[PDB]
Design a protein around this motif. Structure first.
Motif, PDB file in Angstrom:
ATOM      1  N   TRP A  44       0.849  -1.053  -0.027  1.00 58.30           N
ATOM      2  CA  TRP A  44      -0.084   0.134   0.023  1.00 58.30           C
ATOM      3  C   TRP A  44       0.852   1.181  -0.177  1.00 58.30           C
ATOM      4  O   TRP A  44       1.661   1.477   0.741  1.00 58.30           O
ATOM      5  CB  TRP A  44      -0.946  -0.033   1.120  1.00 58.30           C
ATOM      6  CG  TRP A  44      -2.279  -1.056   1.118  1.00 58.30           C
ATOM      7  CD1 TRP A  44      -1.930  -2.275   0.532  1.00 58.30           C
ATOM      8  CD2 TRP A  44      -3.466  -0.941   1.613  1.00 58.30           C
ATOM      9  NE1 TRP A  44      -3.347  -2.923   0.487  1.00 58.30           N
ATOM     10  CE2 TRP A  44      -4.173  -1.997   1.071  1.00 58.30           C
ATOM     11  CE3 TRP A  44      -4.146   0.321   2.008  1.00 58.30           C
ATOM     12  CZ2 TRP A  44      -5.634  -2.248   1.161  1.00 58.30           C
ATOM     13  CZ3 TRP A  44      -5.608   0.158   2.225  1.00 58.30           C
ATOM     14  CH2 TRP A  44      -6.317  -0.839   1.697  1.00 58.30           C
ATOM     15  N   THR A  45       0.570   2.135  -1.063  1.00 54.14           N
ATOM     16  CA  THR A  45       1.159   3.286  -1.023  1.00 54.14           C
ATOM     17  C   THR A  45       0.145   4.470  -1.307  1.00 54.14           C
ATOM     18  O   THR A  45      -0.824   4.121  -1.733  1.00 54.14           O
ATOM     19  CB  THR A  45       2.325   3.099  -2.174  1.00 54.14           C
ATOM     20  OG1 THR A  45       1.537   3.092  -3.467  1.00 54.14           O
ATOM     21  CG2 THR A  45       3.321   2.133  -2.118  1.00 54.14           C
ATOM     22  N   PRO A  46       0.687   5.917  -1.018  1.00 54.33           N
ATOM     23  CA  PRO A  46      -0.425   6.715  -1.093  1.00 54.33           C
ATOM     24  C   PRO A  46      -0.718   7.074  -2.521  1.00 54.33           C
ATOM     25  O   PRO A  46       0.028   6.872  -3.553  1.00 54.33           O
ATOM     26  CB  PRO A  46       0.450   8.142  -0.573  1.00 54.33           C
ATOM     27  CG  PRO A  46       1.888   7.788  -0.553  1.00 54.33           C
ATOM     28  CD  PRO A  46       1.933   6.205  -0.506  1.00 54.33           C
ATOM     29  N   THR A  47      -1.936   7.517  -2.735  1.00 51.52           N
ATOM     30  CA  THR A  47      -2.248   7.874  -4.030  1.00 51.52           C
ATOM     31  C   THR A  47      -1.777   9.311  -4.575  1.00 51.52           C
ATOM     32  O   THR A  47      -1.201   9.820  -3.632  1.00 51.52           O
ATOM     33  CB  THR A  47      -3.986   7.981  -4.173  1.00 51.52           C
ATOM     34  OG1 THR A  47      -4.610   8.678  -3.159  1.00 51.52           O
ATOM     35  CG2 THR A  47      -4.547   6.532  -3.811  1.00 51.52           C
ATOM     36  N   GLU A  48      -2.133   9.599  -5.794  1.00 52.93           N
ATOM     37  CA  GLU A  48      -1.229  10.769  -6.162  1.00 52.93           C
ATOM     38  C   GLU A  48      -1.198  12.065  -5.240  1.00 52.93           C
ATOM     39  O   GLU A  48      -0.301  12.978  -5.294  1.00 52.93           O
ATOM     40  CB  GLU A  48      -1.788  10.963  -7.689  1.00 52.93           C
ATOM     41  CG  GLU A  48      -0.558  11.368  -8.631  1.00 52.93           C
ATOM     42  CD  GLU A  48      -0.888  11.619 -10.179  1.00 52.93           C
ATOM     43  OE1 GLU A  48      -1.913  10.782 -10.636  1.00 52.93           O
ATOM     44  OE2 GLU A  48      -0.513  12.637 -10.860  1.00 52.93           O
ATOM     45  N   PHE A  49      -2.356  12.492  -4.841  1.00 59.20           N
ATOM     46  CA  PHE A  49      -2.637  13.549  -4.065  1.00 59.20           C
ATOM     47  C   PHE A  49      -2.719  13.327  -2.465  1.00 59.20           C
ATOM     48  O   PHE A  49      -3.000  14.378  -1.736  1.00 59.20           O
ATOM     49  CB  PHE A  49      -3.700  14.529  -4.759  1.00 59.20           C
ATOM     50  CG  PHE A  49      -3.720  14.508  -6.258  1.00 59.20           C
ATOM     51  CD1 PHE A  49      -2.664  15.083  -6.984  1.00 59.20           C
ATOM     52  CD2 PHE A  49      -4.606  13.685  -6.802  1.00 59.20           C
ATOM     53  CE1 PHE A  49      -2.457  14.915  -8.310  1.00 59.20           C
ATOM     54  CE2 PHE A  49      -4.640  13.488  -8.512  1.00 59.20           C
ATOM     55  CZ  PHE A  49      -3.791  14.195  -8.893  1.00 59.20           C
ATOM     56  N   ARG A  50      -2.070  12.394  -2.033  1.00 54.70           N
ATOM     57  CA  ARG A  50      -2.322  12.128  -0.593  1.00 54.70           C
ATOM     58  C   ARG A  50      -0.780  11.851   0.122  1.00 54.70           C
ATOM     59  O   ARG A  50      -0.568  11.439   1.305  1.00 54.70           O
ATOM     60  CB  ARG A  50      -3.122  10.976  -0.062  1.00 54.70           C
ATOM     61  CG  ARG A  50      -4.663  11.513  -0.270  1.00 54.70           C
ATOM     62  CD  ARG A  50      -4.886  12.116   0.902  1.00 54.70           C
ATOM     63  NE  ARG A  50      -6.118  12.746   0.851  1.00 54.70           N
ATOM     64  CZ  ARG A  50      -6.843  14.013   1.308  1.00 54.70           C
ATOM     65  NH1 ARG A  50      -5.780  14.887   2.054  1.00 54.70           N
ATOM     66  NH2 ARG A  50      -7.931  14.248   1.400  1.00 54.70           N
ATOM     67  N   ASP A  53      -0.099  13.969   3.626  1.00 54.33           N
ATOM     68  CA  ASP A  53      -0.773  13.234   4.713  1.00 54.33           C
ATOM     69  C   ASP A  53      -0.261  11.949   5.176  1.00 54.33           C
ATOM     70  O   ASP A  53       0.113  11.761   6.344  1.00 54.33           O
ATOM     71  CB  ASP A  53      -2.188  13.358   4.394  1.00 54.33           C
ATOM     72  CG  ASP A  53      -2.567  14.668   4.262  1.00 54.33           C
ATOM     73  OD1 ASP A  53      -2.210  15.628   4.934  1.00 54.33           O
ATOM     74  OD2 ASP A  53      -3.987  14.695   3.857  1.00 54.33           O
ATOM     75  N   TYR A  54       0.046  11.154   3.968  1.00 52.81           N
ATOM     76  CA  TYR A  54       0.522   9.873   4.310  1.00 52.81           C
ATOM     77  C   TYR A  54       1.836   9.978   5.116  1.00 52.81           C
ATOM     78  O   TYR A  54       2.070   9.149   6.217  1.00 52.81           O
ATOM     79  CB  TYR A  54       0.726   9.110   2.845  1.00 52.81           C
ATOM     80  CG  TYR A  54       1.374   7.751   3.276  1.00 52.81           C
ATOM     81  CD1 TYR A  54       0.816   6.618   3.531  1.00 52.81           C
ATOM     82  CD2 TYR A  54       2.797   7.678   2.819  1.00 52.81           C
ATOM     83  CE1 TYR A  54       1.366   5.459   3.614  1.00 52.81           C
ATOM     84  CE2 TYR A  54       3.473   6.514   3.014  1.00 52.81           C
ATOM     85  CZ  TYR A  54       2.592   5.395   3.339  1.00 52.81           C
ATOM     86  OH  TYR A  54       3.192   4.076   3.345  1.00 52.81           O
ATOM     87  N   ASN A  55       2.754  10.915   4.704  1.00 55.23           N
ATOM     88  CA  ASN A  55       4.247  11.229   5.133  1.00 55.23           C
ATOM     89  C   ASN A  55       4.096  11.685   6.675  1.00 55.23           C
ATOM     90  O   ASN A  55       4.774  10.955   7.578  1.00 55.23           O
ATOM     91  CB  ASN A  55       4.959  11.714   4.501  1.00 55.23           C
ATOM     92  CG  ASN A  55       5.376  11.172   3.183  1.00 55.23           C
ATOM     93  OD1 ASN A  55       5.247  10.258   2.478  1.00 55.23           O
ATOM     94  ND2 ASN A  55       5.852  12.214   2.262  1.00 55.23           N
TER      95      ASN A  55
END
Lengths: 93, 92
Positions: A44-50, A53-55
């Motif tokens: 699982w890895t963040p979507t293009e515009f997230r 927030d994920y970091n």
């Protein structure tokens, strides 16, 4: 079993696998939560515009490694990772 | 990595219900009740959690229109684990 039944049983199985290692079986250290996310949701890895927030989310887990989390907070962490890494939520403002 | 598919499945069930109409990122509490009753139909509360379970379900019925977002839906699945899964029998 029904699809959500299998899924929620699996969410509890993973919690039991980590929290049940030792100590209070209803608690995980955030260090163990991060381990669990890294191994169990490895792809699982963040979507293009997230990405930001994920970091920030992953950053907060490292900085409070010794704080404890209960099962409800573990499930909450899963939900947040959906907001950051599942395409369904890409347009979620 | 079974957790990947399990978490994917939790989103799939949400999208099935939230996608019916209106805001695809929200459910009404009535919809949440319907979802939990249908999609976890075989899950029933443990001996000493029946009061809590029945209380939780009845609260949904007292404000059927209130909106639930995805994080609140997932919290509800966690509550149902506490009430219905024997792992949490000793959990305060």
């Amino acid at each position: 079993a029904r699809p959500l039944e299998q899924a929620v049983a699996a969410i509890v199985c993973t919690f039991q696998e980590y929290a049940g290692r030792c100590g209070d079986k209803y608690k995980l250290a955030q260090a163990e939560l991060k381990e669990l996310l890294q191994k169990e949701l490895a792809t699982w890895t963040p979507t293009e515009f997230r990405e930001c927030d994920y970091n920030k989310f992953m950053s907060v887990l490292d900085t409070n490694k010794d704080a404890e989390v209960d099962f409800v907070e573990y499930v909450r962490s899963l939900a947040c990772l959906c907001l950051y890494c599942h395409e369904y939520f890409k347009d979620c403002p």
